[PDB]
């Protein structure tokens, strides 16, 4: 019964920004912001794995309407606020060199975000997707692969999760099954979150694993960059036993790039076993338990 699309992109919900947290601390690379914006009085209801739409000002090259982008809503379905009447993203400010020409070049929607101020309307549809949906069942495992920005949901899985407030209000969802999160990011100033991430760990040990892919403070065995899908191998057999599981469920988010290494290590060590994933997998897909959110 998940809500979609409260919100066509013809007929956008205004709503104030409400905060432009910075997520990347000093001495990391780019900017990622955390922008919680007010669904006061708007009736946009959303739960966690869902996607809003932003729509910035402005028209492109061709003269027409800027159109709207995705972004993964970072927070649960009551807001960082527990109390219903907010939604947040966590966006990563676009900045790339032309192919030719050298010049930086950054992008529409994600400058206009990760420089919006406080007080000012944004154009936000959705929510969209069912993917990325949570297990209602409390006694569920929750594997995590994400990279990037791509902590965004994962974010609304754990705070609804482990977050006191969060299990105050939830009452019916106590989690007791098992969460494990392999997080991808380029260094330590760039791991989003990081304080409450680590600090989930603290709060719920038996419950809550947090393995770091530091991509530029870590090389992996092959003297390349400590990636996802490195750490997936790390720990492949351990992932792939958890993943025969029928309560364990498996969510990808970030660069498509990763699936391919992600299959990779669990296809390898479910040979030891006698058992071909690209068939297995295409299982728990069809099951539901294979969310991937990749962009
Ligand atoms: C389901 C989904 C979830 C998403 N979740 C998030 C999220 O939580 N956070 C987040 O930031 N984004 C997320 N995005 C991305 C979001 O849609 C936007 O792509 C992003 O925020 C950039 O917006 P922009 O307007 O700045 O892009 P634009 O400025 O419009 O730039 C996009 C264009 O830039 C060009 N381009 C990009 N890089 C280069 C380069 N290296 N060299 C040459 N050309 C280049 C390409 O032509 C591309 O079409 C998500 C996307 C989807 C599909
Ligand atoms: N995070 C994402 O999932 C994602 C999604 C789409 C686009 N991008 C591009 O990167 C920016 C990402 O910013 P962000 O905050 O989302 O992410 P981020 O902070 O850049 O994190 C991306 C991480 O992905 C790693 N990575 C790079 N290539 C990979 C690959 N081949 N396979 C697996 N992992 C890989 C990076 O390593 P190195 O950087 O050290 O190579 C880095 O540690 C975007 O603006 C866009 O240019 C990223």
């Given at each position: 019964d998940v809500p979609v699309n409260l919100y066509r992109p013809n007929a956008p919900f205004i709503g104030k920004?409400?905060?432009?947290?910075?997520?990347?601390?000093?001495?990391?690379?780019?900017?990622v912001q955390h922008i919680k914006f007010d669904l006061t009085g708007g009736n946009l209801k959303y739960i966690e794995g869902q996607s809003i739409g932003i729509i910035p000002?402005?028209?492109?090259?061709?003269?027409?309407?800027?159109?709207?982008?995705?972004?993964?809503?970072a927070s649960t379905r009551h807001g960082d606020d527990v109390d219903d009447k907010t939604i947040s993203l966590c966006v990563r400010q676009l900045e790339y060199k032309h192919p030719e020409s050298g010049e930086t070049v950054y992008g529409v929607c994600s400058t206009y975000l990760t420089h919006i101020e406080p007080?000012?309307?944004?154009?936000?549809?959705?929510?969209?997707?069912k993917?990325?949906?949570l297990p209602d069942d409390p006694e569920?495992?929750?594997?995590?692969?994400?990279?990037?920005?791509?902590?965004?949901?994962?974010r609304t899985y754990l705070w609804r999760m482990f977050k006191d407030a969060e299990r105050a209000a939830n009452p019916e969802y106590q989690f007791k099954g098992f969460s494990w999160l392999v997080f991808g990011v380029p260094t330590?100033?760039?791991?989003?979150?990081?304080?409450?991430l680590e600090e989930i760990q603290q709060k719920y040990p038996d419950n809550f694993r947090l393995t770091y892919a530091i991509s530029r403070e870590q090389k992996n065995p092959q003297g390349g960059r400590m990636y996802i899908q490195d750490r997936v191998a790390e720990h492949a057999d351990q992932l792939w036993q958890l993943i025969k599981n029928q309560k364990t469920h498996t969510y990808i988010c970030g660069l498509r790039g990763m699936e391919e290494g992600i299959d990779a290590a669990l296809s390898a060590?479910?040979?030891?076993?006698?058992?071909?994933?690209s068939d297995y997998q295409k299982d728990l897909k069809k099951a539901g338990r294979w969310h991937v959110e990749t962009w």
């Open positions: 920004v409400i905060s432009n947290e910075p997520l990347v601390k000093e001495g990391g690379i780019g900017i000002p402005g028209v492109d090259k061709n003269g027409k309407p800027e159109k709207l982008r995705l972004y993964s809503i007080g000012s309307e944004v154009k936000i549809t959705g929510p969209v997707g993917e990325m949906l569920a495992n929750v594997i995590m692969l994400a990279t990037g920005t791509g902590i965004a949901p994962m330590t100033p760039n791991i989003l979150y990081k304080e409450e060590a479910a040979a030891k076993e006698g058992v071909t994933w």
